Amino acid sequence: MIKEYRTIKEVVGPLMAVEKVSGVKYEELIEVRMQNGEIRRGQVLEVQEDKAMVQIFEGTSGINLKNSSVRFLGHPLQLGVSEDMIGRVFDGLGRPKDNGPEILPEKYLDINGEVINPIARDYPDEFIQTGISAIDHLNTLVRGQKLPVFSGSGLPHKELAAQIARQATVLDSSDDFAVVFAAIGITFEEAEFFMEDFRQTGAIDRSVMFMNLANDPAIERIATPRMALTAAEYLAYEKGMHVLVIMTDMTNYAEALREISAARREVPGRRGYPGYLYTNLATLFERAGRIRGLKGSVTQIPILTMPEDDKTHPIPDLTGYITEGQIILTRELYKSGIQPPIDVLPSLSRLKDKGTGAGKTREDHAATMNQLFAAYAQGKQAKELAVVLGESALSDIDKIYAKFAERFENEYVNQGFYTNRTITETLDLGWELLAMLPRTELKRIKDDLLDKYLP
Amino acid sequence: EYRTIKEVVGPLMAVEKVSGVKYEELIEVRMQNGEIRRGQVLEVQEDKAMVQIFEGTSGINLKNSSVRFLGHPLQLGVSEDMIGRVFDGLGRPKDNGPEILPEKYLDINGEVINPIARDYPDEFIQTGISAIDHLNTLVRGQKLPVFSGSGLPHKELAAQIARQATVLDSSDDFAVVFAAIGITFEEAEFFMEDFRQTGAIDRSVMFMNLANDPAIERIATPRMALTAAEYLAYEKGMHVLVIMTDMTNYAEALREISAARREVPGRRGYPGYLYTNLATLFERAGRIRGLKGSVTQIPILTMPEDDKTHPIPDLTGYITEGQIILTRELYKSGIQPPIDVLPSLSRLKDKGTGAGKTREDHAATMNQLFAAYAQGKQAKELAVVLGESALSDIDKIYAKFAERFENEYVNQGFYTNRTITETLDLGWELLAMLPRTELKRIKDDLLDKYLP
Amino acid sequence: GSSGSSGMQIGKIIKVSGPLVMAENMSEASIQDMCLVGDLGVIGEIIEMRQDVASIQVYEETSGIGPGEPVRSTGEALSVELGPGIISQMFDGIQRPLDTFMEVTQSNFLGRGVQLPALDHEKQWWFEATIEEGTEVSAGDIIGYVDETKIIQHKIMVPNGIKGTVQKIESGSFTIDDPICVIETEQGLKELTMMQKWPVRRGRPIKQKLNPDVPMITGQRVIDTFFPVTKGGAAAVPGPFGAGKTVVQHQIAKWSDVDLVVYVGCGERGNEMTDVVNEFPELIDPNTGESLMERTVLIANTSNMPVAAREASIYTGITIAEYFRDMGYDVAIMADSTSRWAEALREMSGRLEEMPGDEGYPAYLGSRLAEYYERSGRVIALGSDQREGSITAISAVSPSGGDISEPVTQNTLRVVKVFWGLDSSLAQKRHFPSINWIQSYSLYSTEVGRYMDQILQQDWSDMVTEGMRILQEEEQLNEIVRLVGIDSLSDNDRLTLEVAKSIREDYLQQNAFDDVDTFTSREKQFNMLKVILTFGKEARKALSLGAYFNEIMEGTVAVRERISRSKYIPEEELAKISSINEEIKETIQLIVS
Numbered sequence A: 001m002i003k004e005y006r007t008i009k010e011v012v013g014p015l016m017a018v019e020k021v022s023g024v025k026y027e028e029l030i031e032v033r034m035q036n037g038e039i040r041r042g043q044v045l046e047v048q049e050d051k052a053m054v055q056i057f058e059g060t061s062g063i064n065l066k067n068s069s070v071r072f073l074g075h076p077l078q079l080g081v082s083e084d085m086i087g088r089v090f091d092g093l094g095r096p097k098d099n100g101p102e103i104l105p106e107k108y109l110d111i112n113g114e115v116i117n118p119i120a121r122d123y124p125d126e127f128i129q130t131g132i133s134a135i136d137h138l139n140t141l142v143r144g145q146k147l148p149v150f151s152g153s154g155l156p157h158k159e160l161a162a163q164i165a166r167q168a169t170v171l172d173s174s175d176d177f178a179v180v181f182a183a184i185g186i187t188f189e190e191a192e193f194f195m196e197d198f199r200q201t202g203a204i205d206r207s208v209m210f211m212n213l214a215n216d217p218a219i220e221r222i223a224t225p226r227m228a229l230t231a232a233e234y235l236a237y238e239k240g241m242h243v244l245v246i247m248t249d250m251t252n253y254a255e256a257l258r259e260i261s262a263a264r265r266e267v268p269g270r271r272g273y274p275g276y277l278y279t280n281l282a283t284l285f286e287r288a289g290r291i292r293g294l295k296g297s298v299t300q301i302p303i304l305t306m307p308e309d310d311k312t313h314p315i316p317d318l319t320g321y322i323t324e325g326q327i328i329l330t331r332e333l334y335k336s337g338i339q340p341p342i343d344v345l346p347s348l349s350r351l352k353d354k355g356t357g358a359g360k361t362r363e364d365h366a367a368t369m370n371q372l373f374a375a376y377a378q379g380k381q382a383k384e385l386a387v388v389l390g391e392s393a394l395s396d397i398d399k400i401y402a403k404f405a406e407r408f409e410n411e412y413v414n415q416g417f418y419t420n421r422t423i424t425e426t427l428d429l430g431w432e433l434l435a436m437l438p439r440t441e442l443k444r445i446k447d448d449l450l451d452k453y454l455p
Numbered sequence B: 001e002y003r004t005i006k007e008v009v010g011p012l013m014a015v016e017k018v019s020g021v022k023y024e025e026l027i028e029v030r031m032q033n034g035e036i037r038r039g040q041v042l043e044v045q046e047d048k049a050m051v052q053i054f055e056g057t058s059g060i061n062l063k064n065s066s067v068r069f070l071g072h073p074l075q076l077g078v079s080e081d082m083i084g085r086v087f088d089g090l091g092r093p094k095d096n097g098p099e100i101l102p103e104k105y106l107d108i109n110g111e112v113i114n115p116i117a118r119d120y121p122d123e124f125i126q127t128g129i130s131a132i133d134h135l136n137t138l139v140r141g142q143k144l145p146v147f148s149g150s151g152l153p154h155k156e157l158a159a160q161i162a163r164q165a166t167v168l169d170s171s172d173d174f175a176v177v178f179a180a181i182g183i184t185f186e187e188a189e190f191f192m193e194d195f196r197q198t199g200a201i202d203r204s205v206m207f208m209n210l211a212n213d214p215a216i217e218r219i220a221t222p223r224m225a226l227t228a229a230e231y232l233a234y235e236k237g238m239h240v241l242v243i244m245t246d247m248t249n250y251a252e253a254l255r256e257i258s259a260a261r262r263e264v265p266g267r268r269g270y271p272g273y274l275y276t277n278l279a280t281l282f283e284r285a286g287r288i289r290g291l292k293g294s295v296t297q298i299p300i301l302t303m304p305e306d307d308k309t310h311p312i313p314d315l316t317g318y319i320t321e322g323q324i325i326l327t328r329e330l331y332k333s334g335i336q337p338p339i340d341v342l343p344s345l346s347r348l349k350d351k352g353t354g355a356g357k358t359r360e361d362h363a364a365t366m367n368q369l370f371a372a373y374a375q376g377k378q379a380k381e382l383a384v385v386l387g388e389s390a391l392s393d394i395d396k397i398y399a400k401f402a403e404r405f406e407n408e409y410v411n412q413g414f415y416t417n418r419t420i421t422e423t424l425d426l427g428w429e430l431l432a433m434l435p436r437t438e439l440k441r442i443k444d445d446l447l448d449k450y451l452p
Numbered sequence C: 001g002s003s004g005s006s007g008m009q010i011g012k013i014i015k016v017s018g019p020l021v022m023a024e025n026m027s028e029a030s031i032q033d034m035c036l037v038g039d040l041g042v043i044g045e046i047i048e049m050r051q052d053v054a055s056i057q058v059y060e061e062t063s064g065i066g067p068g069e070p071v072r073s074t075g076e077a078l079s080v081e082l083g084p085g086i087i088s089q090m091f092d093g094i095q096r097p098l099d100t101f102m103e104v105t106q107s108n109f110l111g112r113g114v115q116l117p118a119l120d121h122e123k124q125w126w127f128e129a130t131i132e133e134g135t136e137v138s139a140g141d142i143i144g145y146v147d148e149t150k151i152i153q154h155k156i157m158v159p160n161g162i163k164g165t166v167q168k169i170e171s172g173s174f175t176i177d178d179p180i181c182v183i184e185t186e187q188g189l190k191e192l193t194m195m196q197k198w199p200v201r202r203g204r205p206i207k208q209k210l211n212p213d214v215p216m217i218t219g220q221r222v223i224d225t226f227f228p229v230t231k232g233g234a235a236a237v238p239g240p241f242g243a244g245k246t247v248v249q250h251q252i253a254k255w256s257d258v259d260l261v262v263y264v265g266c267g268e269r270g271n272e273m274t275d276v277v278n279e280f281p282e283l284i285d286p287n288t289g290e291s292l293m294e295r296t297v298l299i300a301n302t303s304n305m306p307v308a309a310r311e312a313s314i315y316t317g318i319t320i321a322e323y324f325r326d327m328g329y330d331v332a333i334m335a336d337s338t339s340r341w342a343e344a345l346r347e348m349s350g351r352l353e354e355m356p357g358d359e360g361y362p363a364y365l366g367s368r369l370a371e372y373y374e375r376s377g378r379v380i381a382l383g384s385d386q387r388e389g390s391i392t393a394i395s396a397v398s399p400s401g402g403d404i405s406e407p408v409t410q411n412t413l414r415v416v417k418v419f420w421g422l423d424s425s426l427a428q429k430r431h432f433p434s435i436n437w438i439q440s441y442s443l444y445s446t447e448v449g450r451y452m453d454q455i456l457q458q459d460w461s462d463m464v465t466e467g468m469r470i471l472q473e474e475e476q477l478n479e480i481v482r483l484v485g486i487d488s489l490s491d492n493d494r495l496t497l498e499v500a501k502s503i504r505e506d507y508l509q510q511n512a513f514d515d516v517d518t519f520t521s522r523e524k525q526f527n528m529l530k531v532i533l534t535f536g537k538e539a540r541k542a543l544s545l546g547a548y549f550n551e552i553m554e555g556t557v558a559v560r561e562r563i564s565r566s567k568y569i570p571e572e573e574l575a576k577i578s579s580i581n582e583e584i585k586e587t588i589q590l591i592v593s
C-alpha cells in the first residue's frame, strides 16, 4: 500500500507543508506528484502532530497546491548500488544521465550511511605518491586520508585535482584507484574538463560520476555528496576497492545548506550559515579511511573555493578543523607562473608522520621536510623585505635565503601539471636546494643525515 | 473619519475597521485636543492600516483621536505664481506672501518618463564659472552634482550658480528651483538674504527645509521641488535648473526613517534601497521629445570623512552624469571656487559646446588645458619629492602653467560672472605660455586663428 | 456560482506592502503564474502560496492599491511572445512595446495597468514554407522562414512539446495569429502560427552544450589580445562609477561578430537607453548596408522604473537570446547592470521577511546568478538539423566603492571565465578602455591562443605572453621608481618601462569615438603588437652590444612616433604598419655603429 496525501497546505520556495498525515517519519523520502504528472522528490525535515515539513530537491516551480499530491515512501533517501555503477554517469540524485541501461541494484543503502566504530578503524599510513613534490614531501597524502584543496575562483584547482587522480599510486604494488566524482553546482565547462580528462586517460572505465551542475536545482546539492560517498563506501567496504573520491565545489554544498536554513527561518550562525555547519560537513568528510580486516579504502580530496580568498570564512575554517590537513592554492603563486600554485606554508598534512620514512619513502624524508619549511619561511620573509627596502637591507645570510625561496618556488614547487616525480627524485631535489645554505644553518637535520646526503 | 486607532508604537500607528484605504495614501489625525497631524499609510492589510505620523505620536490619546483618510498621496498645488515665492519642505508658504491659487494638484512622486519618449540632454547652460562652463560643461537636462565636504564653500558656490545661471539667446524662459534640505536656520538665512539681495529671487522658487523639521518632511522636500520644476518645464515650456543641498542630510533622514521602521540596514547602515531612492529623484532630470522645456539638476552633497566611496557620493556617482569636486587643498590656497578639474567630469558636455552653442574652439582648448594642467601638477609633485633640479626646462614651464591655471583661471571669486567668451579667451592666454609645438591636442587651423 | 451565474475565480487583495501583494481565493492558480492585480490590473507574479492565499510580486507601482480589490490569474507563467516583429523593438522589463505604449496611452510618461501584446499581431508577414508535407517533425525543426530584416531570416520552428507529421503547409502572407501549418500529432491535429510563447524563468531546451572555443572579435585591442571572450563564453565587467562601462559595452554591441545583440538596460540611466535608440540606427554596416538597430532587441527598465521589473528584464532578455540561438545564430546578451537585479531581489526578500544572507541579499542570490549564466553558452540546438548556436553573456557589475569583494561580483566570478575589471584611476588618467590589465583575466586565453596561432599561422600566443610579462614587470619596476626614483634603474630596466609604456598607450589605449581607432581588425592587431615587440627586441640586443639606453631613445624618436600612430592607419593600408619593423632594425643598428 502506497501512502499518499492530497493535502498540501503551503508552498514556500524550497519548502512545503503537508497536513492531515499519519505515520510519517523524520527524514523520510517523499515524492510530489504535480498536477501535470511531473514527479519531484523531497525529504521530511520535521514532523509534528498531523503535519510534515518537507524540502523539495527540484524546487516547487509551477506547482498547484490543490491538484498535487505528496507520496511518503516509507524509507529515507537511498542509493541502489551495484558494481555495475562503474563507468556510469548519474545526475545529482543518482539517476542515469548517460543514456545507458538502468542499473539492477544489488541492494539499497541509506545515503546517510553509518559511523565507522573508531575501534574498527585502521589507521591510514600507506604512502600515496602523487608525483607532486609539494604534496609528496611536505604535505604527504596517505591512503584513507581526507586531504582537501582550498582554492578560489579563477584558480587551477581542477588542474591539480585531475593531476593527482592521474598520477596517484602506492609503491611496491599494482593497486589502482576506482574514482568517485561528485560535481556540486559547477559549470558545464568545469565538469567537461574532468569528463575529458577521464575519457582521455581511460580512467572513466574505473569511475562512477554524480553530476549536479550550475543549471541543476540547488537543493539537490545537499544529497549529491552523500550519494557519492555511499557509492564510495560501498565499493570500498563491500567490493574491496581502493576508492579515490573527488568532490567539487564544496562551497556550493554549504550555500545550499544556508538556503534551506534561511528558508526555515532557523537561528543563524556566522555569515547566515546554520549552527550545524561543522557537524554537517563532518558527516561527509569523516566518511573516509580504512577498516580493520577489510582490503578496501576511501581517500577523499574535497575541493572548495574560499569566498573572498578568506581562509577564516566559515567554509574553509570549519573544513580545516575536520579534514586531515589542506592544500592551499594562492593567486600570488598562480600569477607568478607556479604550477601547481601551492603555498606550502599554510598547507598541511596531519597523517604524514606514519606514512613516511625508512621502508616507506626514505629515511631523510621528515628531516628535509622540516628544514625546507624553515628555510622557505625565512627566505620568503627576506624576499618580501628586499623588494621594499632593497637587496642591500638584508644580512649576508638572509640574502642566501632570499635566493633559496626563489629557486624553491620556481624549481621545486613549480613542476608542471603533467610532471610526475618519484619520491626519490623529490627528496634528491630537496637536497640540492638545501645545499645552497651553509651547513651550520641546517639545524633541523642531524649530522648523520647531512654527512650521507648533503652534497 | 475613523475613531478606531488600535495601537501606537513609537511613530507608528495601527488603524482598524477601515475600508477603501490604499498604499501610500495620506492620512489626517485629529487629536483629542483639536491638534491636527498628517501621516502616510505604509502598509494596508484587510481591515488594518499601518501609518506613520510626520510629527510623531507624542501626546496622542488613542480612543479620543480620529483618523481621516484623504484619498490621495502627498501632493503639491502648482501654479506659475510660485516664482518669487518661498515654501517649506511640504510646499507651505514661508514668506508671508499672498494666497496661492493652484492650477492643479500633483502627486509629488511624479511619473516616469517613457525611455522612448525621453530626449537626450542638449544645449548650453552658462553658469558663469569657468571650471564648469569650459572643462565640465552643464547641459540642459543633465544631472551634474557637486561633491564637497564639511567646511568647504559649497553654499557660496550654490548661490553663485543660482544667480548667474542663464541660457544664451533665449529670454524670459529660465527659472531656478532651489531646495534646501535639513539645513540650519542660519544657513537658510544666508541663502534667503543672498537671493533677495541679488534679485535672483525674482526668477526662483524656493523650498526651505530645516535641520529641526520632521525627517519625513526633509525627504519630501526634493520631491516637492522637482514636482514644481517639471510643471514649470513641461507645462510652461521653461528651462529649469534645480539646485538641492545638502543631499547628505537627505540620506541621513532616509536612514532615520528606515531605522524607525526597523528595516534591514544596508552598507554603512543606510537603507538597501538608497540607490533606487536617489534615482527616483535624479532621473526626473532630462528633456522630452516634442516638448519645449527641460529639467536640469545640481545635487550638492558633503562627502563624509571626504570619502568618495561612502554610499552617499558613491551611489550618486552611479546615477549622475559626472561630478564637480571641491577640495581642501585648493580651498586652503584661496581658490574660489576650489574646484579640482582632475577628478571632475561632465559626461554630456559634448551636447552643449562648439559652434552655435559656445564657440568652435571649445573642445580643443578643453582637451589641451586639461592635459597641460595634469602634466603641470605631475611636475609639481615631482619637484616636491625629488627637488627642483629633478625637472626639465619643459617640466618647469608646465609647473608654472598649473599655478596660473589655479590662480587666474579656476580662481575667479564667488561674485564674479564670466561669459563663455571670456572663459575661452582666458584659456588661450594660459595656453600661450606653452610652446606651440606642445599643443598637440589642437589642430593647426585653430592654433593659427586663436592663439595670441 | 453566485446570484444565479458563474465565471472564473476572482482573487481578493488582503494586503499591500510595496511591490508585495497578498490575495485570497487563489486556489486555482499555480506558483509562477502571472496575474492582474487590483482595479488597475497591474502585472504580477505568484511566488508563494499558503492555503488559498497567494503572495504576489508586482512588476508595476502599487501606490494607490488596497485590500478588497480583485485579482485575476492568467493561468500562465511569466512569458515572452516569440515571433516576427521582435527585432529592432524596445521593450520594457515584461516585454511591453514602449513606442506602442506611448501611442496608445498618448502620453510621454509611464502609466499603469496597460495591457499590450509584445508583438504586432496585425502586421502582414510573408511566410516562406521550406518544409514538405508528410515530413515527420519535432521541437526545433524549421518549417519555414520570414525575412524580418534584409539580413536576418526569422526561422519558424516547431514549438517544444509538438511532435508529428506535417499535414498541410504553404507559403503566403499571414499575421502571427494565422495558422500556417497543420501538424498531425498522436494527440490529434494541432495548428501552428509564426509565434510561440515561452516562460522566461525556464531555459529553452537544447541537445547539448559545447565548449566555447572560438574567440569573439570585438575589435577592442585590450580584450581580443589579453582578455578574450569566446562565442558562448561569459564576461563580467565590474567597475566603480565613471569608469566608462557604458562605452565599453556599446563598443562590443556594435563591433562584435554576432548575428544579434540583446541589450538589457537593467536598473540604470534613462539617457543611456536614449543614446542607444538614437545611435544604433545610425551605425551602418558597409558590407550589407544594415544598421546595428536592425539586429538588436532592446529591453529597458531604468533605475526609477518598477524595481521588480529589473529581474523581469533579465529573464525576458536571456529567453529572447535563447530563441534566436535555437535558430542557429550567435547572440550577445548585454546586462547592465546585474547589480540592480540583485538589489531587486534584496528588496523583495525584505518584503517577504526572509533571513538575509551576505550583505542583506537573499540566500539564493548565488544560485540565481549561476543559473542565469549557465543559460549562456555554445550549444547544439534541438531539431534534426542538429544546428549550432551560441549566447555570449556580457554583464556589468556595479560594486559599491569599486570593491569587488561584495556578493554580486564574487558569486559572478564563481561561474564566469572572463573578468574585465574597470579602474577609476585609469579613467581619471584618460586611459580608455579603463581595463586594469594586472587584475583582469580570461580563462579562455590559452585556448584562444591555440586558435589564433592556427588561424594566423604566427606565434601569436607567445607575443601575447611576452606583452603581459612586460606589463607585469613594469608594475614591479614602478614600485621601485616610487621608492628610489627612475634614475636608479639600469638601462635594461629603463628599456622595459619604455616598451611597457608603448604597449599601454600605443596598444591598450583605444578611442571609441575615433573613426579608425574605434575598431581594430585581427590582422591589424597582430601587426601593431608585432611592431611594438620588435622595437623592444632590437633595443634589447643593442644594449647587450654596448649601446646605452639614452642613445637608443634619442636616435629612435621618429620611429617610435610612427609606432604610436599605427592605430590610426586605415585597414587597407596595413602594409604601412608592417614596414615599421624594417625601420626599427635599420635605425637601431645604425645607433650601434
Ligand SMILES: [Cl-]
Binding pocket: B317, B318, B319, C240, C241, C242, C243, C245
Ligand atoms: Cl557609472
